[PDB]
């Protein structure tokens, strides 16, 4: 993975393009994805 | 002159206190923001 760059990610099937950045603020106890009020993915956990 | 000045100053103080105390004194402005936010949220939610 390359961060701080407009890439075309694919984590376990889910697609999308964007800039992947460090998100140490968000805490995922056991969940996989992330979501917003407008129901859009905003943070993903790296399977690697 | 003295009485009118005192009444005016007291009225200014009273309106300042009333604005600072009550919470529902600015509905006519919050309603527009809430309506626009609702419209945008519904438009985004239509994607799914
Ligand atoms: C699992 O991921 C870690 C991450 O550093 C890596 O060190 C380790 O080698 C991986 N396991 C295997 C079996 O490759």
UniProtKB/Swiss-Prot annotation, chain B:
Residues covered by region (Heptad repeat 1): 1-48
Record function comment: Subunit of the fusion protein that is processed upon entry into the host cell. Mediates fusion of the virion and cellular membranes by functioning as a class I viral fusion protein. Contains a viral fusion peptide that is unmasked after S2 cleavage. This cleavage can occur at the cell membrane by host TMPRSS2 or during endocytosis by host CSTL. In either case, this triggers an extensive and irreversible conformational change that leads to fusion of the viral envelope with the cellular cytoplasmic membrane, releasing viral genomic RNA into the host cell cytoplasm.
Name recorded for this polypeptide: Spike protein S2'
Portion of the full-length sequence here: 920 to 967 of 1273
């Amino acid at each position: 993975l390359v961060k701080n760059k407009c890439v075309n990610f694919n984590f376990n099937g889910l697609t999308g393009t964007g800039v992947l950045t460090e998100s140490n603020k968000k805490f995922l106890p056991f969940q996989q994805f992330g979501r917003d009020i407008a129901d859009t993915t905003d943070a993903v956990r790296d399977p690697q | 002159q003295k009485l009118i000045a005192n009444q005016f100053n007291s009225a200014i103080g009273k309106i300042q206190d009333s604005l600072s105390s009550t919470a529902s004194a600015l509905g006519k402005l919050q309603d527009v923001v809430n309506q626009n936010a609702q419209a945008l949220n519904t438009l985004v939610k239509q994607l799914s």
